[PDB]
Coordinates of C-alpha atoms and ligand atoms in Angstrom, one line a residue:
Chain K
X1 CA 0.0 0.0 0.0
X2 CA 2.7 2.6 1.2
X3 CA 5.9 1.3 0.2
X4 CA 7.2 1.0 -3.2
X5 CA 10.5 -0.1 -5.3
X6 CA 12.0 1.4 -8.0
X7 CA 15.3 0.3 -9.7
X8 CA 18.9 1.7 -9.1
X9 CA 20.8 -0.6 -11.2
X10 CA 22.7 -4.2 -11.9
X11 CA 24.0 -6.3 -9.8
X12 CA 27.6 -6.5 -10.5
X13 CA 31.2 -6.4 -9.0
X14 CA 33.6 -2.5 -10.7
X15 CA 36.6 -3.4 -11.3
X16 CA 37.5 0.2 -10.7
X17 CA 36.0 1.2 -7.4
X18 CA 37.4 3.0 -4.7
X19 CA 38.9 0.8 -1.7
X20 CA 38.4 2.0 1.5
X21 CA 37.0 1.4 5.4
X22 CA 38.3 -0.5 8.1
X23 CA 38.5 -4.5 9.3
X24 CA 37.3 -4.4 12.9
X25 CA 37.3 -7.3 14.6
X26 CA 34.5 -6.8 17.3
X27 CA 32.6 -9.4 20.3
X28 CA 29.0 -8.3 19.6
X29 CA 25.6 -10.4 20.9
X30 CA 22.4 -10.3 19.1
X31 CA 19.4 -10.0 20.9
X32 CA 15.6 -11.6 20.1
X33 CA 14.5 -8.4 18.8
X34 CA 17.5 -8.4 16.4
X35 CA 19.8 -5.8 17.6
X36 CA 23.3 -5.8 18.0
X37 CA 25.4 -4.3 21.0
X38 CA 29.0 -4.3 21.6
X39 CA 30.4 -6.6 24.1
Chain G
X1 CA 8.8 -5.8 -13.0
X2 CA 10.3 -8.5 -11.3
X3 CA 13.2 -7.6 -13.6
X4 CA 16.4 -8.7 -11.2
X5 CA 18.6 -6.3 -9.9
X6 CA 18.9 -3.6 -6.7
X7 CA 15.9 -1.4 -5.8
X8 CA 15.3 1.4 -3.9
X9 CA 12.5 1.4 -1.0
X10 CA 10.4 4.7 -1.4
X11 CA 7.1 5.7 0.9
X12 CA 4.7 8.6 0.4
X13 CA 3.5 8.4 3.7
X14 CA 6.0 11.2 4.9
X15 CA 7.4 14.4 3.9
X16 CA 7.5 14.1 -0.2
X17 CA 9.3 11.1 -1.4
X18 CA 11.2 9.2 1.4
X19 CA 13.5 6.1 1.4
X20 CA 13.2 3.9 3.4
X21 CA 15.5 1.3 2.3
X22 CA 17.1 -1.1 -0.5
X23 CA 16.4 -4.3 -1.5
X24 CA 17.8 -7.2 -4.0
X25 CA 15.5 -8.6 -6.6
X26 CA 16.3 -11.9 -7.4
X27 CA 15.0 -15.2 -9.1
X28 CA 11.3 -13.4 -8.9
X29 CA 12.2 -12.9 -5.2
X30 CA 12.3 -9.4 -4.0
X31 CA 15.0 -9.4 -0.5
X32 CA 15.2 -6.7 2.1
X33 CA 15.7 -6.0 5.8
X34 CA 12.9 -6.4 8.2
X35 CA 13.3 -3.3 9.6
X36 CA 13.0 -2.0 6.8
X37 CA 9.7 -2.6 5.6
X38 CA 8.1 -4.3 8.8
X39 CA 7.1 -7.3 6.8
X40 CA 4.4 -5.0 5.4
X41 CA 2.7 -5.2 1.2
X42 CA 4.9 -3.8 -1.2
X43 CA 4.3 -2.4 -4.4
X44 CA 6.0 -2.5 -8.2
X45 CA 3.8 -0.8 -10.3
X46 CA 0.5 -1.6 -10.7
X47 CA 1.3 -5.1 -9.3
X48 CA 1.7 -6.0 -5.3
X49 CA 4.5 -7.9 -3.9
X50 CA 3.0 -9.8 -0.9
X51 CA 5.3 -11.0 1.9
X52 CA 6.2 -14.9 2.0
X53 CA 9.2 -15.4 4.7
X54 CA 10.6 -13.5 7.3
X55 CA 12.6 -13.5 10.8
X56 CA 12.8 -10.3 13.4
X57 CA 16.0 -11.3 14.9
X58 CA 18.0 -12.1 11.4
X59 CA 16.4 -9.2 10.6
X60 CA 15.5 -10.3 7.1
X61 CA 12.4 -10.6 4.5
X62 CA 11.2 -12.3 1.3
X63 CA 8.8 -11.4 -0.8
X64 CA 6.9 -13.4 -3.5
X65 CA 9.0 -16.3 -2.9
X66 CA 11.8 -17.9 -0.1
X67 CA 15.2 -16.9 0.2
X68 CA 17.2 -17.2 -2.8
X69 CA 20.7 -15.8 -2.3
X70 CA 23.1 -18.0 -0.8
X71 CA 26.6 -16.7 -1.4
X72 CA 28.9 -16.3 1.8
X73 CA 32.1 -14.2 2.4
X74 CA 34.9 -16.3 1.9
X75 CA 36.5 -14.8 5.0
X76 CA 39.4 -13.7 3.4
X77 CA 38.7 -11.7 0.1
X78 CA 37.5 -7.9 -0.2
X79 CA 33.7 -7.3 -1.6
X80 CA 31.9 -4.6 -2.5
X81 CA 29.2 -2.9 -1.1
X82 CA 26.4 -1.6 -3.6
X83 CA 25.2 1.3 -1.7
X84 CA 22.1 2.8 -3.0
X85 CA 21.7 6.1 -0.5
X86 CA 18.5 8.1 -0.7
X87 CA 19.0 10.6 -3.6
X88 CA 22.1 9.5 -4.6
X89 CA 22.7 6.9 -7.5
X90 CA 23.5 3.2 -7.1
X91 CA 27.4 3.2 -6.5
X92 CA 30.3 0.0 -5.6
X93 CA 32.5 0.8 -2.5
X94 CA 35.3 -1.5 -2.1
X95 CA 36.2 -3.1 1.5
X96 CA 38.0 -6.0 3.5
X97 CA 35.7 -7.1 5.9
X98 CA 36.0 -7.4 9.6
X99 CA 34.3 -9.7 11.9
X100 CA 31.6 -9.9 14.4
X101 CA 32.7 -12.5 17.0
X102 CA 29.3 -14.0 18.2
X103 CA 28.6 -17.0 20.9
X104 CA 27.2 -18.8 18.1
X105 CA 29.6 -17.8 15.5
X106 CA 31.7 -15.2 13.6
X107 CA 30.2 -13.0 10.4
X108 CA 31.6 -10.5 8.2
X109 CA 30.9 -6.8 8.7
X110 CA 31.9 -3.8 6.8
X111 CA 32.5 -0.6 7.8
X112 CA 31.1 2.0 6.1
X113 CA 28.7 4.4 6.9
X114 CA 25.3 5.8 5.0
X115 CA 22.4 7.2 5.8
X116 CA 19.7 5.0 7.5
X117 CA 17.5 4.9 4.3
X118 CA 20.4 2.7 2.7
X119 CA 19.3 -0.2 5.1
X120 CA 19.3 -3.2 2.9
X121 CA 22.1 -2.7 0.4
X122 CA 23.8 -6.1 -1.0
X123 CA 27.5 -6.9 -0.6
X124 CA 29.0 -8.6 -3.3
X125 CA 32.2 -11.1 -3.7
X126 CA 34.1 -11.2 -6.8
X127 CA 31.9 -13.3 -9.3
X128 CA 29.1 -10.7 -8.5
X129 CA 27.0 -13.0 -6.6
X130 CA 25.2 -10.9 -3.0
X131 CA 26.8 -12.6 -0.1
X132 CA 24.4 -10.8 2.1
X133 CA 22.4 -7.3 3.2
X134 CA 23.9 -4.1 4.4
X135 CA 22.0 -2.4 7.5
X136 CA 22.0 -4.3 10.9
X137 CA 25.2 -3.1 12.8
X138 CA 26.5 -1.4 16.2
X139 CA 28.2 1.9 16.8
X140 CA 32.2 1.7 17.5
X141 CA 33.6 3.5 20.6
X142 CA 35.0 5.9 17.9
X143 CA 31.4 6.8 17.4
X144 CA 31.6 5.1 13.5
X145 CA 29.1 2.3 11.9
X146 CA 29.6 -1.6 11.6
X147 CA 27.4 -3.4 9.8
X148 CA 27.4 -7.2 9.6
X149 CA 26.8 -9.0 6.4
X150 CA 23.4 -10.6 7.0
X151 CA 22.8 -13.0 4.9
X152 CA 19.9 -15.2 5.1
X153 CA 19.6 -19.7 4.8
X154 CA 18.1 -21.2 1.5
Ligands
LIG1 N1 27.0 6.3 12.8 C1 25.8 5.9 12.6 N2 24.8 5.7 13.6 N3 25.3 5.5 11.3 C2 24.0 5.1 11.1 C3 24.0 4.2 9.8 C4 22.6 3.5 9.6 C5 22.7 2.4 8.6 C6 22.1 1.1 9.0 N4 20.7 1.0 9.2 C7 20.0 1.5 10.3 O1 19.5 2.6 10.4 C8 19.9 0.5 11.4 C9 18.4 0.3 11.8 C10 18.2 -0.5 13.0 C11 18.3 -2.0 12.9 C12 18.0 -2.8 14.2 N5 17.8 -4.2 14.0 N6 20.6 1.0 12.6 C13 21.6 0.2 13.2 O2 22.1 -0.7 12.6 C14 22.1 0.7 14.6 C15 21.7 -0.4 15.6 C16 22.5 -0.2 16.9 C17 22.0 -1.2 18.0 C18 22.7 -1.0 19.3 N7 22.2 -1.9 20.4 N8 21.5 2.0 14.9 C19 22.1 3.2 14.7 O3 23.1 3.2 14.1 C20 21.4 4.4 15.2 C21 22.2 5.3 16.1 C22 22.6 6.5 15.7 C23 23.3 7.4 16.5 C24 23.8 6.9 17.7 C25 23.4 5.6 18.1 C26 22.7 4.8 17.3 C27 23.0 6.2 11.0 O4 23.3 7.1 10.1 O5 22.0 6.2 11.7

C-alpha cells in the first residue's frame, strides 16, 4: 500500500571502485528483537 | 517488473518522497531487511508484492518467494558494497571485511557508513553474486558504523 520499489541498477562487481573502510574485529551479541550491541 | 537487480525502497506516507531502504531482486524474489519494511505489502507498479518469509531477529524478509541468495564471504577476500543512498545513484564501495565474534559464530561486517534509508544494500564477492544485506550493525567507541553482512539460509 505505502511502500514501493523502483530500480537503481545491476548487480555486478567494478573493477575500478574506490577501496576503503576498516576491518574491525568486534565481540558483539544479538538479541531476540535483532539488535546488536558491543560486548 | 520482477526484472532482477537492486531497488530502492520509497514511501509517500511522509514528507515528499522518502527512502526507506534497499532491497535485491532476485529469481522473482524481492530481499530486504525487516526493519526496513516491517514485513508490510509492497508495491512494483501496478502489481503488489505480498510477503512470503521472514525472521525479526535475522532481521530479514522475502517477498513473492523464499530466500534465494546464498553466497557467503569467503573470509578472506574484499567485496563490494552496492550502496544505494537516498537521492544519490547506485554506486560499488570496495572493503575488507571485519568480523563480528558472536557465541554462536563469527560473520563479516563492513565498515562503512550511509544514511539509515540505505538499510538493505547487498555486498558482493568477486563473481558478483550478494553474499548478504547491508544495514543491521552497532556503533564503535569511535562513534563510527559496523554493519554485519546478514545473509539469510536457503
Ligand atoms: N553512525 C551511525 N549511527 N550511522 C548510522 C547508519 C545506519 C545504517 C544502518 N541502518 C540502520 O539505520 C539500522 C536500523 C536498526 C536495525 C536494528 N535491527 N541501525 C543500526 O544498525 C544501529 C543499531 C544499533 C543497535 C545498538 N544496540 N542503529 C544506529 O546506528 C542508530 C544510532 C545513531 C546514532 C547513535 C546511536 C545509534 C545512522 O546514520 O544512523
Amino acid at each position: 500500500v505505502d511502500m514501493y520499489i523502483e530500480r537503481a541498477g545491476d548487480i555486478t562487481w567494478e573493477k575500478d571502485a574506490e577501496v576503503t573502510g576498516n576491518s574491525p574485529r568486534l565481540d558483539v551479541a544479538l538479541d531476540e528483537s535483532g539488535d546488536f550491541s558491543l560486548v | 517488473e520482477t526484472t532482477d537487480g537492486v531497488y530502492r525502497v520509497m514511501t509517500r506516507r511522509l514528507l515528499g518522497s522518502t527512502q526507506v531502504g534497499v532491497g535485491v531482486m532476485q529469481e522473482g524474489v524481492f530481499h530486504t531487511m525487516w526493519h526496513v519494511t516491517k514485513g508490510a505489502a509492497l508495491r512494483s507498479g501496478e502489481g503488489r508484492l505480498d510477503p512470503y518469509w521472514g525472521d525479526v531477529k535475522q532481521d530479514l524478509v522475502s517477498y513473492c518467494g523464499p530466500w534465494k541468495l546464498d553466497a557467503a564471504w569467503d573470509g578472506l577476500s574484499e567485496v563490494q558494497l552496492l550502496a544505494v543512498p537516498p537521492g544519490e545513484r547506485a554506486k560499488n564501495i570496495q572493503t575488507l571485511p571485519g568480523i563480528f565474534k558472536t557465541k554462536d559464530g563469527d560473520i563479516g561486517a563492513v565498515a562503512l557508513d550511509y544514511p539509515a534509508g540505505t538499510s538493505g544494500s547487498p555486498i558482493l564477492d568477486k563473481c558478483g553474486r550478494v553474499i548478504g544485506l547491508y544495514g543491521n550493525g552497532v556503533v564503535i567507541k569511535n562513534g563510527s558504523y559496523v554493519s554485519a553482512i546478514t545473509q539469510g539460509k536457503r
